[model samples]
Target: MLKQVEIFTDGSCLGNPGPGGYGAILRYRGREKTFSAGYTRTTNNRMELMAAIVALEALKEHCEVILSTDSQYLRQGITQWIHNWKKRGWKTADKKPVKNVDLWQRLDAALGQHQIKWEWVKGHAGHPENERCDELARAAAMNPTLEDTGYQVEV
Candidate 1:
């Protein structure tokens, strides 16, 4: 059996490094599954990356995906900048180590089983799926039960 999946995701950080969470909505064959999780200490971008990672990780088999995100950082990082970043041994343009290296690597691992066409949507701009994901993320952040053990303060 072959199917195409659609995923919409969002991340929220109440203090940018305080309470944070990520949400993902997966759709296939007229069914939908929503996933959201909160972490005690994390950043918005990390949550964003987590959202992508977890969503892709949820698939049980190989799939074709239309994965949508509101963050240019996630989209560009996975599709474009990651290649150059790899060439430079994960260094930024100014030679600093990349932020969120942990999540980036996990997202890459998750990408191994799927064919994905990344899409960027305007967040908080009345797109229903994105808005729902935003709502889920915010709520999860406010009531987090887990810790982002991989989070580091510039390490």
Candidate 2:
């Protein structure tokens, strides 16, 4: 019963739909791993979603995880709305296709593999992990490495 972990994550965007990045820190026992990456074009929301997915995906096994995030959208969407979305075949109440279904599906699959306790932390605060994640995300956003396939490629 010793497999426990703490995670902190953040996302950043140069513009609403411009280059974006996500950063995550997975703390296990006394050690931690930092992961950050960027995409050519995406939204802050998408990056926020990516941050959580990246952290969970990094897990090597089923762990009791405490995941902290500054984005209410990520926390609430998963905790409060996802079941309903899936129940409705990923459609909104107004019959609009749910946004970011791609990442949402991935998050759900990751969640099924581990136990996570979601917590919300205030953004841009002095919290060390949070601050570090912000720094990582902002830095990656400035140096995008891959094209964002989920965002509609506008031409």
Candidate 3:
């Protein structure tokens, strides 16, 4: 059997459809790895979904992944309702096309190969890892550097 691992992720956009960044923290076997990247133009939800996709995509192989995030859209979409959305061709209950479908699609594909447990936590409510990820995401968004940014990577 594989070892159990956990991760926390968060995303931030400075101005709705402005500069965006995503942050993730992975904990496995007492080791912690952190990841953050920003895009020149993106939305908060895109960043949020991108964070999860990036984290899972970085994994070496399929494993049990307990992923934590604050986005209700992400939580409910993945754990509760993504199948329905997919069945409707990415439309919502109101028959409106879903927003951020690209990121959602990428997330769905990334998750298809992993055993993931999606969990939601309140943002900025004293959760240590979540707060750190928020800080990292915001910093990456506000003062993005060419070197550490996601300019070369596909995340």
Candidate 4:
């Protein structure tokens, strides 16, 4: 049988373009691992995407993943919009440049390494893992800034 993993991720920002952080919880065989990181300057979406990337990258071997997140942007972007964006040379259907292409590319690469079932849960809906992830993300966002080269260049 294929190994299966469950993940919950959340991201937070003090401001739209302020200190940000991502939190992730990975569970396999009843064991859980948590991760969080702060970024100097980033958007909520970036942190949201980063959470999943961080979680997936933590694995040493490929597995089937059930990734849960509060952000529809992260969930739908990966499961749906990415196909069109890639086919359109990374442009949106309206022919506009996609935002956060760097993180998207990184997420795409991370996702390629696993079989993932993208799951979206309502934020702050009393889900234990998701709530914990939010708390972790918020706490990390208050920590000292870490360089986010992509944010620096884009802003």
Candidate 5:
């Protein structure tokens, strides 16, 4: 039988467009793996998207995933905005280019690999896994070293 995976993710940035990091925890049955990474210059949104992207990428095969995050941007973008964006050839409703299109495209490809149920939770409101993810994200941001090539090239 295929595993049913649960994931919790969080992202942090030292400034709106500065050092950033992401954290993700994946659980299947009784096994769990946690991951975190930092970027020298990026946005919280990018890190948020990266968290889910990395978690999905970690799976070796297709599975059902319950992904929890504190980011409306991540949840709503995947569940709702993605459809409209695709319909418009990746442009926004206002006929403008979408922000973070690269990450969004990467996420869309990842989503095609599994059945995913996106969940939104309140940040810093005491959920254990979410809190732990936040801690990991913050810690990573504090010691960022990896460069965000997408961000650097764009700006």
Candidate 6:
């Protein structure tokens, strides 16, 4: 059997390197799942990539995936520039070391485990799942008592 999946992810940071959160919503067949999480101290980019990694990581295996993100860094890094960055030893096109290498590394590994087609969506453009993910992400960032929603599909 073939699984067809669509995932929408978003991340938010109350303050850069301060409180951060990420959220993802996955749709497979007729079921849906949502996941969200936050860090006491982290960057928005980390949250963004984390959302993608977590969403992809949740798949059972070898599913056809359409992963959407609002972060250009995440989208471009995976689709357009990651290969060159790796070739340059993970440095950016400008020769600077990638800022979030750790998350990117984890994301790379998580991504390698499955086949995913990445896409970029404009943040806050009224896309349903994207908006929900943003809402969850922001809420997670603002609420410390909320368990780190870190990443999962709600199914």
Count of clashing residue pairs in every prediction: 0, 0, 0, 0, 0, 6
lDDT of 4 by residue, 52-147 (tens): 888988887788998888887787786789998888888776776688888888888888888888778887573799999998999999993687
Cα TM-score per model: 0.89, 0.90, 0.80, 0.88, 0.89, 0.81
lDDT of 5 by residue, 34-107 (tens): 99999989998899998998988888888899888888789778778898888889986677678888899998
Candidate 3 on 59-153: residue-level lDDT in tens? 78777888877876687777777888888998877777676666777788888988877677776563688888888899889865533222221
Q: Relative to the true structure, how large is the alpha-carbon lDDT of every model?
A: 0.85, 0.87, 0.77, 0.84, 0.86, 0.76
Tens-place lDDT digits, model 1, residues 30-137: 679899999999989889888888888888889899988787679778778888877898878788878877888788788888888977877656368888899899
**Model 2 over residues 63-117: C-alpha lDDT tens digits?**
8998888887897897799989889998888787788888899888999998778
Winning candidate number (lDDT): 2
- Residue 6 of model 4 has an lDDT of 89
Superposition TM-score, candidate 4 onto the true structure = 0.88
What would the per-residue lDDT of candidate 6 be over residues 24-74, giving only the tens digit for each residue?
998865778888877777777778887888887887777778887788768
Span of 10 residues, lowest total lDDT, candidate 2:
146-155
Arranged by TM-score, best first: 2, 5, 1, 4, 6, 3
- Residue 93, candidate 2: C-alpha displacement in angstroms: 2.2
Worst 10 residues of 1 by lDDT: 118-127
Displacement of the residue 3 alpha carbon in candidate 1, Å: 4.2
Instruction: Find the 10 residues in a row with the least total lDDT in model 5.
Output: 146-155
